[PDB]
Each structure stands twice: as C-alpha cells, then as structure tokens.
Design a protein around this ligand. Sequence first.
Ligand SMILES: Nc1ncnc2c1ncn2[C@H]1C[C@H](O)[C@@H](COP(=O)(O)OP(=O)(O)OP(=O)(O)O)O1
Ligand SMILES: [Mg+2]
Ligand SMILES: [Mg+2]
Lengths: 1089, 266
Amino acid sequence: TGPTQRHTYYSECDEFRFIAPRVLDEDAPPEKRAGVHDGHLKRAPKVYCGGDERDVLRVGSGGFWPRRSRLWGGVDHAPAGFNPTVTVFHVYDILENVEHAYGMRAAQFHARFMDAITPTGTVITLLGLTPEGHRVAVHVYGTRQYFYMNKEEVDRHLQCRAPRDLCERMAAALRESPGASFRGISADHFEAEVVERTDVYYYETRPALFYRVYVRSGRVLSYLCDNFCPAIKKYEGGVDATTRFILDNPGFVTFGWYRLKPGRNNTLAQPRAPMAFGTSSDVEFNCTADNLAIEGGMSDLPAYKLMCFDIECKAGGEDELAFPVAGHPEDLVIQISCLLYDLSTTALEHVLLFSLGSCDLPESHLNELAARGLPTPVVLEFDSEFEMLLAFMTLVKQYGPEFVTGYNIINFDWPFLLAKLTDIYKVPLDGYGRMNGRGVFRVWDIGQSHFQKRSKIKVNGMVNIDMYGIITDKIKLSSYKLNAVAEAVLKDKKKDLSYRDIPAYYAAGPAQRGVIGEYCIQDSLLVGQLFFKFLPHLELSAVARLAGINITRTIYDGQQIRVFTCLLRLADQKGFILPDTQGRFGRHVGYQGARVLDPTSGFHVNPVVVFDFASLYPSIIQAHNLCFSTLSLRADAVAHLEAGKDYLEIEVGGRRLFFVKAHVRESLLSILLRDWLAMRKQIRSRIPQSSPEEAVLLDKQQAAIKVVCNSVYGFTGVQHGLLPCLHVAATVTTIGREMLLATREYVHARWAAFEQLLADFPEAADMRAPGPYSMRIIYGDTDSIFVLCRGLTAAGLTAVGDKMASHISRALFLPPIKLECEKTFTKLLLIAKKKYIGVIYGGKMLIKGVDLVRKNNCAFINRTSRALVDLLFYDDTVSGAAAALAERPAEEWLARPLPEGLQAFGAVLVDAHRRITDPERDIQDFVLTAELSRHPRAYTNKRLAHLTVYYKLMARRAQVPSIKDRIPYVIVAQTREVEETVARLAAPRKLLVSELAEDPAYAIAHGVALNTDYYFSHLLGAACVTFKALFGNNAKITESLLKRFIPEVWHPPDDVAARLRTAGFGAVGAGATAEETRRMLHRAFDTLA
Amino acid sequence: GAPCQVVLQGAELNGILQAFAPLRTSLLDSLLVMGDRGILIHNTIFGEQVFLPLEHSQFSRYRWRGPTAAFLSLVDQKRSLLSVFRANQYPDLRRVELAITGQAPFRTLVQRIWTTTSDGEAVELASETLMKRELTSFVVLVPQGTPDVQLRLTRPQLTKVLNATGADSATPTTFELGVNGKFSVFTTSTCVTFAARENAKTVYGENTHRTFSVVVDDCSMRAVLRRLQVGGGTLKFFLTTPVPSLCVTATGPNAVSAVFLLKPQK
DNA sequence: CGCAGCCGTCCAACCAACTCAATTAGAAC
DNA sequence: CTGACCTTTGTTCTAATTGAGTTGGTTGGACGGCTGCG
Ligand SMILES: Nc1ncnc2c1ncn2[C@H]1C[C@H](O)[C@@H](COP(=O)(O)OP(=O)(O)OP(=O)(O)O)O1
Ligand SMILES: [Mg+2]
Ligand SMILES: [Mg+2]
C-alpha cells in the first residue's frame, strides 16, 4: 500500500548512467588515460569512506553523513513508541498546496478536514521546528481565496438574479475552456455572497454592493481573472492563499513562534499517521486557524541547520582549458564542499567533501582545522558523477537544511547541478525539497526578460541566501570575486585556484585531488564567516514579519509586494477593496521630481552648515494626509467641507488636486508608514552603545529600512505597477520642491544681519569671527541646503545649527516634518550638482559623486586622485595657494606663473607620470570595470569596452559573465597585431577605446602591453574634472594649467635618426656636452644660413 | 632680472618679417633652439626637414646665458608664439620681446607684444602674452660643414627646375652638373639645362668644378617648396657624406632653408 | 602692334577640429 | 476521475564615448590681364 501520496525522490536504484574520467584508472596505458567513460551500469550506487563501503540510498546503522529524517521510502525509522507532545513551534516557511478528498480516502483524517477539501481545497502548510529540535509540519484547512466584482455590473452583463446564478455561469465558463482542463467543475466549487465595500481610489467614491466569490483553487482563480467576463472590473484576484491566511487571522506572522490550542467547539489538532505524512518531518498535524495562536514571549530562533556549499568542475573535452559547460556529458562536477552549521549557536558541526575519485587532504590543512577547533573533514569517495550527485541530493533530503548558502550559487552552482540532474541523468527534482513530491525546485535566470531585476531560486521548504547577493548590497567594491571580498571584509588573503589549473591537479593522483579539496573547503569556510558577520536571515525575517510575506518572497520578490501587502492589511480593516486593473504589461519619466539648486562652484574655506530633512517624503505623506482614499480631482466632491481647514488644494502638473485632512479621513499610506519608521528608529537607537564594527552593521540595516519607507512613495509612481497613482507621487515631489525653496527664502530673510541672529540665539556672541557676516545658501539637493557662514567660527556652529533647525521647522512646517542640522564643513569643494568633497569639523573627509568614489575606475588613477585631494585639504601651503587662485579671473593664470604653494600638487602628477611607465607595473592597478547591466543583445550602442571583452571571453570559451556581473578589462596598446585582428574579424585607422579593451588574465598570460597614453590622459582627465572648481569651472583652462606641470620631451624617430646621422650630427641638447651643444649650434647656423 | 633677453624693435622687426611673410601658417608649429648666436626654428614638412636660422645680428638687443634652451612653439597645443610674424596677425607691432628666466631645465619663457595705437603711443597686447617652459630634454639633428657646390637659381629658373620634378613615389628624378657646367636636371620623361658659370640660360655658381649626377626618391619636394612661397633660392649640395643631401635656401639676407635627402647613388 | 608668358586673384576642394546628440554607467537624492 | 505559469520603488544629475555634421581656413589650380619682347 505505502504512503497516501507517492514519494518521488529516489529511495532505491539498481541501474544508472556511469560517467567518469579515464585518468582514475591508475594502472591503465598512457593512450587510454584521456576523456571519460560513459555507459549504463546495473548496480546500486555506492559510496566509499575510510576503507568502508556502503550503498548511497540505504538507511540503517553505519551511515557516513548525518540524518534528521524519520521516513525513507515508506519505512519509518523512528524508535518504537516515538510520540512527542507539540505545544509551541517556530514557523520559518509557509506552503500552499491543493488536496483532493478522493486522493485522501485512505488517510484516517477526521471529518472536519475532509469537508474542507471536498471536492478539492487549498491547504496551507506551516514548516517549523519545536524547541526540542523536532521538525514539524502543520497543515491548515479552511482557507479560501476570493475576489470581488460590482453587483450592478454583473447583474446587467449576465442577467443573474441570485448569487447561485453567478456560480452556475462561472462553472459554465470553466467547462467550456479550450484544453478542457477543468473537467468536473460544478457550481458547488464556488460560493458567492453580497457584501458592501468601497473602491479605494478617490474620496468621493460611495460604498456599493459587490459579490465576493470564494474559490477553492488558485489555478481556478487565475483562469477566472484572466478570461471570465473581461469587461467587468475585478478586485484582489491576485492575492494568494497564504496572504489570505495571514491577513484574515489578526496577529499571525510568516516567521515566528506559534502554539496549538483548542478551537471553536473544543476541537483539537489531529496528529497524522506516518504513512499520511506529506513532508520530511518528525511530526505532522491537521488543524484549522482556530487551533493556532501566536506566542508573544518566545523570540530566540530554534536549532535550525544551515548548509554552506561549493562545487568544483572539470572540463573534459578536447580543450582541457575550456570553461566547463553543464550540458556537455564529459564536463563533470568533481568535488562538492558541504559545511553544516547550527544557526542557533553559530557552531560548525560537520565538514563533508564529496569527491569523484580518491582524495587525500594534505596534513597541513587537517592540522590547521584542528588548531581552530573545527570538525575533522569526512571525505566521501565516488566512482562516477552520478553517484556523487545522487549522494549530495540524498544528503539534502535526509538532513533537510532549512537555510542554504554559498557564494554565487544562484548563477553557477545550483544551475550546474540541476542541469546535470535534469538533462544528463533524468532525476525528478520535485521530491527533493521538504515535500515528498510535487514541490517546487527551480532556478530562474534573468535571460531575455525585460522586467527581471535578478535571478531567483525557489526550493519548496528551503531558504536559499546567496552571499554574493548580500555582499553586493552592503560593501562598495570594483570586484566581487570572493578573494577580493575576503580581503576587504574579513581581512585575510586566501590563495586561489583557477579553472585553468584544475585539470592538471586532477590527473596527478590522490594527493593533488586533495589540494583541490583544501581549496573547496577553505572557500566554504570563508563564506560561512561572511554569513555570520552579516547575519542576513535576521534582517530578512524582521522585514518578513512586518510586511506579512514569507521570507523567500522577502529575499527575491521586490519592494512593491511588500508595500502592497501592507496596504491590503489596512484596506481590509477599513472596508476598502483594491482593484486589479493589471490586464496588460514608453521610456521617459512620468512626472517631475526634485529640485536641485544651482551650486556656487568653488573652494570654500569658511564654515558650511548642512541642514537636511529627516524622512522627507514619508513625512510629507504623513503631514499632508496624502492617499488614494483622500484624493479628489473634482471641486464638487469637497463642496461641503471648509477650504484650508478641512482640505489641501494644490496645483500639480497643471491640475487642481484636493486632499482631505486626517480628521475627515486618515490616509492609508500615512498609517502604513508608522511601523516602518518605528522599525528604523529602533535600529538607530542602538548605535551609540554598540562597538565600532556593530555600528557599521547597524548603519546598513538602518539604511535598508529607509529604502522600504521611500518605496512607499515609489509605489505610487510605478506606471503599470500593482496599484499606481501618479497624482499622489507628483504631489509629494511638488510639496518637496516648495519646502526647499521656502527654507532658502526663510534663511535669507531672517538672518541677513548678525543682529537678527544674536536676537534669536544669544550664544552667537562667542562665535563671531573677524570679517563681514554673511549667511547664504550655496547648494542644495531635494531635502537639504548648504549654508555658507562666513564671519562665524566652526566650533560653535554645531550647537547653533541644532537651534536654527528647530526654529525653521517650528516656523514653517507641520509635524511630523523636521529639519535637522546634519554636519558642518571646515573646507568644501563644490564641484557640480551632486559632486563635492569636504572635511567635517572633527577632521573626517566626505566625498560625494566624484570618480574617486565610483566603482568603474582603476586603482592607479584613484590612488593618485586621493593624493591630490589630500594636499588640497590637509596641506596648509597647498590649501592657502588654492584659496589664492580665486583672486584672479581664471584665464589670467594662462599668462602668469601659479602661486608657489602648488609645488607639491604638481609634484604628485610628475611622480604619477613616472610610475605609470615602469616595467615592474602591476597590471591589477590598471583594471577598469563596468556592470553588464542587461542581456548583451538589448544594447543599442554596441561599441562598449565591457561588451568587447564579453564577446572575446565567449569566443575563447572562458567563463562568460552573468547579467549584472561587473566585467574587468584593461586598455592595451595598439600594436599592429591588433589592427590585423580587429580588421580581420570586422570586415592609418586610429582604433576606438572599446576596440582596445581586453581581459586582464589574457593580457597577463600573453604579455600584452598597457596603453600608457590612455591611462595618463584619463588620469589628467580625472584631475581636471575635480579641480576645475579652483579655476572658475573652466575645463579647458584647468586642462592647460595641469599640463604645465608635466615634463615635456621631444626626439626624432629612430629610423629618422638612423638616416640623419649619415649626414648632419644632431648634437643639439641631450646626447652631447653643453660645450659640444654650443659648438654644434655654431657649426650649424653658419652653414644652414 | 631676465638674464636672457631678446628684442625686436621696429628697426629690426621688418628684417624678420621680410623673411617670415612668405611663410603662411607653414612654420607656426616648430621647435625653437637658443644660444648665444640667435634662434633656430625647426619643423618637418611633408616628411622632410626645414630650418630657419635667425642670427642674433637680426635683433636690436640680445643676451644669452647658461646652456642652450629649447621650446616648442605651440602653447596649449593651439596658439603659437610664432604667430606674431604671420602676415597681419596683428595690424601693427611696435616691438616684440622674448625673456627667459629660472635655472637649468625648467626655465620659463615669456613672449611680450606691443602695438602702436596711434596717439603717439604703444600698449601691451596683454591678452596675447605667451608663457612657455623649456623642455627638459631634447634631441635635434642639424647640418654642418661647407657645401660641395652651389648654384644660385633666381625665381624663374628655380620654378623651371622645380616644375621638372616628378611625382608620387615611383617616378625618378635627378640633379646633375656635368663637364662644361650644363646643370642638366632631368627625368626619363622631361629635361632642362642651365649654363653654370663660376644669356638667360645662365646659373651663377660656386665650386662648380666638381661634377656629378644624383637621383632623389623623396616625394613632395615641390609641395614643400610651394607651401613655402620660395621667391627664388640658392641650391647647395652636400656630397662627401655616405648619404648626400641638397639644401635649398631662399635668396636674401636671411632665409628659410629646406634640406632634402638625396639617394647615395654615387 | 600683336602675341606669349607671368603674376595675381578668386573659387573650389580637402582635411581637421569642434559641436551636438544619444547612449550608458553610476551616483545622489 | 487531472495537468499552470511574466515581473515589478521614483526622478535628477554629471561625465565618457561614439558618431555625425558643420564650419573655417588654407592651399592649389585655372583664367584673365598687363607688360615686355620680337
Ligand atoms: N532610493 C530612493 N527611492 C526613492 N526615493 C528616494 C530614494 N532615496 C531618496 N529618495 C527621495 C525620497 C526621500 O525622502 C528624499 C530625501 O532623501 P534622503 O534625505 O536621502 O533620505 P530621507 O530624508 O528620506 O531619510 P534621512 O534624511 O533620515 O536619511 O529623496
Ligand atoms: Mg564556487
Ligand atoms: Mg533627508
């Protein structure tokens, strides 16, 4: 008989495709060592470990890896009489599935559950762990999806006369579908009720009658939304059953502690019998929502297990040094590292190496691991690729890690594995997650899709966190290779192994395969350290709780769904419904954004105070009660209210809009924001008591929550989004623009004279510096102004600034709007809009927008630019000389030597011009980078350096970059072989920059020379754009003056000399003594004339 | 102050301009070289060497100090210090001055310009002041020794000798001075002759005793000699070297000169 | 006095430099 | 009495790079006019 539903993972296997490298036959002839065996073999898959040997798929006593699994196939392996009491459990994940009563006949389910899935129903499975470490699944019965349609409309269109009629007309529509995939659907599969609700979109909208239609399947709901009566507007048809479960049971959460309890008539949750289990769990329960409640007190995580894994591959074709491609049978996975951690404790518990072929780890690696008190590695040895991959999947099923991590596992590792398991071997993956079959196990690349922000993985009960994703969001680097990240974040240098090196190590015998093993283990250990520094699961679960969505959606599914779910929570409890209006789907902007003030470019050596609004756009939404529900586009809507007292009237984009005030109706967006603003405060509250490392981590968490608050504004601005309203978005930016200008005009009126300031702040008297007093706005962007405060001292302006900010705020705006005094500069270089460099009153340097802090540029030019900046700001002779340049019009410096103090500034450039030519130059200092922002086909301009390097890599069969990867390149010198190459492939031509781009590894290997002219002109370019501000923003003058620092030199060409020497001895200058110089010039004039 | 000074007052200025007017934005990009003896200007035109020796005689005040100095004529690689001497670049120019300052490499040159504005007075063309720094190192290759023979081609017969030259790169051309002094320049296609003496046939000559014939592979010779508005000029030959050359200089007290590499065809 | 050659002026051709637009990266908000 | 899959915060700004078009300047060649010589 066996289990109620079939397990689809492998529990027995008698025959398989055997593929393995011939170089593992240690006693084979030299002629037989190449390539791979590939044929079928009839035996059970085997694993070797420490001289012992076992079948891969056998469960029993002497296993080689840990297990947390109760059932295997149909057999139960729990001790006799195993039966734990469950009261409290922690849920980390939620599934949605459909159960059919006929499929469940033989399971001994109580009647209450059978009624909920007759003839079919959706079941919601909570996945979790008890505090004793038992894996639990709770199956929740009785949740139904539903949507709304306007009753008058439906009545008119279909001629319905009772709710039962609409159910009959829906059943008809389903039956007559092409593909006929809804056989058996009847009116009783639907329930329709008349209710009163209101559409959420404008203030004057009256409540009306809607049919609410309950549907027992999401597949059915999808079809009805798309295809049934398309003229009729539908509401909330896109909401999933999980969301319905979470929102209809107030207080329930997608991540956290629950307890089981008696229900509505003293019903209790039913334990499932093991042959009725749906998942790999210790205990399973059937219940309804009445049997669940949240446990407020419990907050710590239980003993979840984290797996960190990495794979290594070997190409097996004719070119050993091609990058491996998973679709080729001979390009094999050779090793898998797998580290198992307890997330409750941070402790590493197991270190497993899977290895095709024998593998002896070097004694030094074992001693190192022992010294750090880490578990001794268990090495698992396999004869063929299949046996190793099956074993790894067997571990994943039997151990069931709730969290899985790695580095670049979503773009490389999982795709490579799953390709092999699907295409080479024909293994079904739907049973390898938590469910025993019919579950999701997929990767989505970005591919040709115009929409997708990122690649994704979903495995039905398993949270995948790629640390490559996490790191790119938290640290700014030009490269995100793991050695660069390890250097930058963990502060240690890993040695590294290139894919070019692996094929020669592999062929050498067991010891060298051991060296590969060490590299895999070390890589996985680094990724573990990164994981436990950033602790991403805690940040993600906090957001998941607040948004009302599961943690996997919290990782992969964007900002809009977070906002939408929050809005849905509030809408429901106020009587509003949300229109779907998304039946389909330009390149330009939808509305006017922020005002940036024209900067007074220059070098400023008087103090500058920066004022910035805290949480500007959220505060505007809150202060002025902005919402869908509070908006009107008509004056007759607000005719019965009082102007100014009850509503804001505002011109926005040439329309007169109206927003009702909060005592007339509260904004749903205003309420939504409260939780997220609170969450951000709670993080920032902890910064001053935290360590210097904790403080940096907390600052980044803080900033991620700010992104959610701003995405509430953004949500309204999305054309073709889930619930657009460009009127709201444009209002927010309009009000912001007004506030910025108002703040400037206030400061220019109130404190024009020192008298006025001293009248407002008596402490001003101690702050008076010697020259004339002035306070003037020299710059400002969106929500901040820069006030140049000549005549006052920096020491006091910090304190006075707080008071000024308070004063302005209380004079001009409505709470929660708060202007704050952010910082004071002692020196400032305003370069352009969004580009400035300055020093804060403590001594700290701040840099915004300039190439010195953009990730595209090379290390040589960055380090030189930083040196020039340091001289302007921290060398008194240079700062003084820079301030002197402003006394003359810029072009006057063309006809006069510069102030002498700029000596050291010029000296830095001459040194750079020297060092750039040295043969001992480190090519890595010259590496440029750009992101591959999109699929290479979607580019219009195709002459790009990174695209040039992209196609070269593809044609050389190197590792091809993924979309959204940064691509490194160098610019090479055009030796004639380049002209030959590019002309040959395409069809005195000076090649473009994009045609000289090259891969750094190739350029090293083939000794290719760097383009010194490009790099030095690009270095002067960088200096020029950064120091134009000292010369009136004139780039041409800046360029000219900067060139006057450089040593010019002139010579005849070599063959020109080889000729001229024959007749006419050019001893002019270098090449002869000053005596011979004057002699030869005399010698020459008197014959040339 | 200003250890080196070079000056062109109006009395001497026209001595330069009379030599420089035939030059039409042709010499504007050049190297300068300076010592006690005056200025040498040098440039390559169509891949062959051109020189203008401006002797310190041609100047109203002059002083040199320290080692020789060298400067490129362009400033910002756009404007040029030689501009003053071009045509009517400026309608009037009462005087011009070069001053050189500082020490060793890194000496600073300024060129200063003054113009009559009627009113009995002259004023600085201040906006046109040019400042240039000595180049730190240089190699320049310059000619030497007494020429082997000279012919004095007045403008008409210069033009005839010049028009008889070939073109492209394939076609041959040769200069000749055979016995009896025929100066029979020719190609396989075209021929001319002029009566060398140490009526209108004659070319006045020096050291014509030595007789020779020699081909030239150099293209664009005539192109260069037109770019330069060569208002007639002496030809003088250098033949003792393993590669020979022919130097053409305009007829006058001071002159642009261009040096053309001949073939070592004996 | 007539014809031929040389010189001067004007117009066209060719080459280089500068400007403008659009795409892209990547930041600041 | 049985099947499923597209996604998803906003606008403003500078700078590099590439490609096309426009403008200006200079040089070369042709034709006409004037002067000199036969
Ligand atoms: N990522 C973003 N998406 C959308 N709007 C943004 C984003 N960043 C900034 N803005 C807009 C809305 C912000 O309210 C406004 C000003 O931003 P900014 O001052 O950086 O933050 P903030 O004022 O919202 O928070 P705080 O000032 O406390 O950091 O610019
Ligand atoms: Mg890897
Ligand atoms: Mg702000």
